Design a protein around this ligand. Sequence first.
Ligand code: HEM
Ligand code: HEM
Ligand code: HNI
Ligand code: HNI
Lengths: 140, 140, 145, 145
Amino acid sequence: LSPADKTNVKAAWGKVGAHAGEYGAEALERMFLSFPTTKTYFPHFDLSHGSAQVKGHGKKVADALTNAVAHVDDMPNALSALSDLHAHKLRVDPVNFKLLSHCLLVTLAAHLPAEFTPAVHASLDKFLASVSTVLTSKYR
Amino acid sequence: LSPADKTNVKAAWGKVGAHAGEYGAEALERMFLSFPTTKTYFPHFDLSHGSAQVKGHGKKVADALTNAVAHVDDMPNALSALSDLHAHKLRVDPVNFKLLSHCLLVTLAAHLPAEFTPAVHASLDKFLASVSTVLTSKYR
Amino acid sequence: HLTPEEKSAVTALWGKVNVDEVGGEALGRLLVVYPWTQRFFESFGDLSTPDAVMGNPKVKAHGKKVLGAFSDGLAHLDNLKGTFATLSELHCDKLHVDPENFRLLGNVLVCVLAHHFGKEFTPPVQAAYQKVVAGVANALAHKYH
Amino acid sequence: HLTPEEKSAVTALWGKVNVDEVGGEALGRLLVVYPWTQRFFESFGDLSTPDAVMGNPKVKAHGKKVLGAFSDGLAHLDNLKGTFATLSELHCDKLHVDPENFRLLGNVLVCVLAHHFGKEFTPPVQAAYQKVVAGVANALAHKYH
Ligand code: HEM
Ligand code: HEM
Ligand code: HNI
Ligand code: HNI
């Protein structure tokens, strides 16, 4: 991650603002539709169109993401509480993090076209991958 | 990269010592034979067994690994010259890095059986995964 | 593995997809998002920054060839392995491209589709295109698989 | 595609393999090095520490079955998609294991063979075994294709 990528990421998720909680909800929904095997990680959940469980969890993913962009120079310590849940408790396969980051990138491209430029895209994919790397590292 | 992992890498590369130049060259030899596609990055090298170039290059990769062990807390700035050699003028796939990391672990398993414990195996793999991403970033 | 509702949504959206100006940004974004893929296209010249890659006549012209290959496979979904048979050989033994990059371009193509259509590229439409990009990537990696 | 020289060296080293331990050592190491794979073995018990995984009796017993499936593949190299047909159905439809974990276990097995044979596990021998573990992983993933 470069400071040029940091300026691209801050600007991109700076334009999402309040929509992030709904963007994360769409990105979540897209993952279950595109890659059904990911639904095993949600055994009780109701994963249908326009669900408060998906919308509420969408806000959780987006709030963790807004903290990550604000703490871009300190990600393993700021996301430490989440890195323990995803790696020790949930033990999510790192492939699923590539799948959600892809759907998140799809949602950003669909809602923000003037912002989703190849320079922003490359930085966003780098940001999400480093967020994924941090989230799926605290395990042994 | 927990303190337990930093302790394990020290006890693994401590028994290596002078054998670094020999182990690094073997890891390259293992990579060229098991994965013949990686050879396309070295057409200016005589990849045949019993090469002074591979023994010297192995020593360079091994001492860069020894350099990365000391700067495990701040790897992106220490291997700055490296992260520019492979990412910009060589444009190497991170898949090839996973291959060398695997070949490095195979060499260490064959030469140091007592040191190749599952905990050290997990620590070295994680350390090499961190060295790989440092070297496969800021691409432009 | 595409059903009539999925197979129709794939073709209906592809009718609006401009064959000459969709693959160019897909090949371009691949070279910007995953820049190690530039080693294969270095006869092209300058790829210094994202703007240079996007504004490269050779990049956009090669994108037409890639999207052209995707388009013929979209009509021949029944036997994708036979349709991409000649390309699967050239992409694996003639020019050593790692099979991981095939699904990287596919998932980048999906990002370009959302970027162009917006709300029109809905989750079931993405789900339909995902089975296609996985299929094409698999059909282009069989010459070792 | 293994050469008769690779084929012969492959059967020679495999004949000296400790059928009772190597499998469990390989399955145990996969669970420690790659800790997400632990999700598929919750009904196995204590895996909290690296010694718990290695000492675990069902990790050893299950590893014995996995090695048996590998030995099966070595005896029928020209029919891997067939030898692993039921297991490819099990791991994809019923277990939902990501095909990337097959590539990991295959590589962990290679590390185990290196740890047990030492300098006897020479680079051309590893090269031959890489063909096998790649062949087994690819055959275990055909149900996704
Ligand atoms: C961009 C990456 C991701 C972020 C930022 C993220 C964020 C979060 C957050 C904030 C929570 C709630 C944590 C809490 O308040 O205790 C959560 C829960 C969860 N996440 Fe993630 N997550 C990500 C990726 C994933 C992926 C890829 C999966 C699996 C496919 C996943 C599965 C879960 C599950 C299962 C829960 C708990 C839901 C439940 O109650 O069953 N997450 N995630
Ligand atoms: C690529 C090499 C692999 C081979 C040859 C292999 C082989 C086997 C075999 C022979 C079984 C026995 C099933 C039965 O009792 O009928 C088995 C079961 C299983 N395998 Fe695999 N496997 C491999 C990789 C994996 C990986 C990488 C995972 C997980 C990350 C995995 C998870 C399982 C699970 C969860 C079961 C079911 C065990 C149970 O009964 O609870 N396998 N595997
Ligand atoms: C297959 C490609 C490839 C991989 C995976 C790879 C992985 C690694 C890893 C990961 C563990 C490390 C620590 C590493 C270290 C080094 N490499 Ni890498 N290198 C690779 C291809 C090279 C090439 C090519 C050179 C330069 C050759 C030369 O002599 O100029 C190189 C040169 C080096 C040098 C010497 C730099 C110099 O001359 O200033 C070091 C040190 N490296 N390389
Ligand atoms: C990053 C590497 C890379 C990827 C991921 C990739 C992925 C794809 C995919 C989707 C998975 C498709 C459908 C596709 C289609 C094509 N590629 Ni690919 N190609 C790639 C690198 C090339 C290169 C390189 C060439 C030709 C260059 C040469 O040297 O001739 C190429 C040429 C083509 C051609 C033209 C054939 C010819 O030269 O006559 C088509 C069509 N392709 N390529």
